[PDB]
Amino acid sequence: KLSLQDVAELIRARACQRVVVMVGAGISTPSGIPDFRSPGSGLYSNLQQYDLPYPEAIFELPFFFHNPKPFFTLAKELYPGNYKPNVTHYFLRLLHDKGLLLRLYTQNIDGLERVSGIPASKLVEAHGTFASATCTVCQRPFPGEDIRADVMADRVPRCPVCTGVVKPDIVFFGEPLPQRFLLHVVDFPMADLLLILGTSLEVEPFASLTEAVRSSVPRLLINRDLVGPLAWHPRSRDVAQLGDVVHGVESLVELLGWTEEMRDLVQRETGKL
Ligand SMILES: Nc1ncnc2c1ncn2[C@@H]1O[C@H](COP(=O)(O)OP(=O)(O)OC[C@H]2O[C@H](O)[C@H](O)[C@@H]2O)[C@@H](O)[C@H]1O
Ligand SMILES: NC(=O)[C@H]1CCCc2c1[nH]c1ccc(Cl)cc21
Ligand SMILES: [Zn+2]
C-alpha cells in the first residue's frame, strides 16, 4: 500500500511526470461555491424557492425549455468574475509550472482552473463553460460575455436573430459532452499518476475514467470520502487522503517540499487578482 509520502517521492523524483487530474465541485467549496450532494449545503438540498418538480430539474434541458428563470437566477449567483481560485486550484497550477500536468479534466463550470493560470491547452472543461453561449432555437453562437449584463440584471437572455432563449455552453445533465472531452482516450493511457480531487464520482462517463489509467498507475484521491471506483474497485497502488481538500492538498504540498513555493505563488496570484 502506497502512502501519501510515497506519491510525493515519486513526483519529486520525476518518476511520475505525466499527471492526469480529475476534479469536481468539492475543489470549489473552499472558494464559496456549493457542491451538489453535501448534506445541508449542497445545491440539491436548498432549491425550494424555485418550486421545481425535483432538485435536478434546474440543470435539465426540458425543464429549462419550460421555465428558464430558475436556472438564470441560480446562474447569476454562480456567475464567474468574483469567486477566486483557492489553494487546490493553485496546487494544480503549480503542477503545470513544474511541467508535470499532462491534462486537467474538470466537471466544474466556475472557470476557476483558467483563472488560476492553467493554459486552455492543458484543460478539458468536460461540463462546458460560461465563456460561450448558444441560441437554444437557431443554434447561433455568441460570446459568453454577451449575456453577462442580462444575467446580472435578472433578465432571461434572448437571441437577437430569432428571439429564442440563449444558454451558456454548459452541459446540462445528460446532454452530450463537448468535443474536447474526446481527448480522454489519448490522455488516460499516457498518465503515469492520476489525481482525483473533490468529486463524488457518481456521474458517468466521467467516473469510469478513474478505471481508464494503467493498473500500475497510482490513483490518489483527495476528498471528504472514499468514492466511486476507488471505493468499489480498488487497485493495489490506490492512495486515499480523506478529509478537507485544502488540508489534504497542503499535506501533499509539504511532503513535496513545495510549501514555500506555494505560499509564494498564492501571494503573487492573489495580488494579480
Ligand atoms: N471542502 C471539501 N473537502 C473535501 N471534500 C469535499 C469538500 N467539499 C465537497 N467535498 C466532496 O466533493 C464531492 C462533491 O461531489 P458532488 O457534489 O457530486 O459534485 P461532482 O462535481 O462530483 O459531480 C457533480 C456532477 O454532477 C452534476 O451532474 C454536475 O454535472 C456535476 O459536474 C463530494 O464527495 C463531497 O464530499
Ligand atoms: N463548481 C462548479 O462549477 C459546480 C457547482 C456549481 C454548478 C455546477 C458545477 N458544475 C456544474 C456542471 C454542470 C452544471 Cl448544469 C452546473 C454545474
Ligand atoms: Zn436564435
Q: Structural domain boundaries of the chain?
A: 1-29+86-126+179-273, 30-85+127-178
What is the rounded CA–CA span in Å between residue 133 and residue 129? 8
Residue whose cell numbers read 452530450: 176
Question: Which residues does a gap of C–N over 2.5 Å follow in the chain?
Answer: none
SS3 assignment, position 160: coil
SS3 assignment, position 76: helix
Task: Give 240's DSSP letter.
Answer: E
Architecture of domain 30-85+127-178: 2-Layer Sandwich (3.30)
**Nine cell digits for residue 79:** 456567475
What is the rounded CA–CA span in Å between residue 116 and residue 84? 8
State this model's resolution in angstroms.
Answer: 2.0
The structure's method of determination equals X-ray
What is the rounded CA–CA span in Å between residue 100 and residue 86? 20
Asked, colleague to colleague, whether 1-29+86-126+179-273 and 30-85+127-178 share their fold, the answer is no
The answer to whether domain 1-29+86-126+179-273 has CATH 3.40.50.1220 is yes
What is the rounded CA–CA span in Å between residue 207 and residue 211? 8
Ligand 1, residues at Cβ distance < 6 Å: 24-26, 29-30, 35-38, 42, 107, 127, 173, 198-200, 202-203, 223-225, 227, 244-245
What is the rounded CA–CA span in Å between residue 106 and residue 25? 9
**Nine cell digits for residue 136:** 437554444
Of these residues, 66, 89, 96, 127, which one is catalytic? 127
What is the rounded CA–CA span in Å between residue 157 and residue 159? 7
CA of residue 150 relative to chain centroid, distance: 25
Q: 220-238 burial by CB neighbour count: b if 16+ within 10 A, else e?
A: bbbbbeebbbbeeeebebb
Residue whose cell numbers read 475543489: 27
The radius of gyration of the chain's CA atoms, rounded to the nearest angstrom, is 19
Q: 162-187 burial by CB neighbour count: b if 16+ within 10 A, else e?
A: eebbbbbbbbbeeeebeeebeebeeb
SS3 assignment, position 136: coil
CA of 108 to the centre of ligand 1 (A): 9
The candidate with the shortest Cα–Cα distance to 200, out of 57, 56, 38, is 38
**Nine cell digits for residue 228:** 466511486
CB 37 within 8 A of CB 46: no
What is the rounded CA–CA span in Å between residue 116 and residue 90? 6
What is the rounded CA–CA span in Å between residue 27 and residue 21? 12
Q: What sign has the CA pseudo-torsion 165, 170, 171, 172?
A: negative
36 Cα nearest atom in ligand 1: 17
Using a 10 angstrom Cβ sphere, with 0-12 exposed, 13-18 middle and 19 or more buried, the burial of residue 127 is buried
Element (H, E) at 239: strand 238-242
CB 125 within 8 A of CB 42: no
Sheet holding 128-135, edge to edge: 141-143, 128-135, 166-170
What is the rounded CA–CA span in Å between residue 152 and residue 134? 18
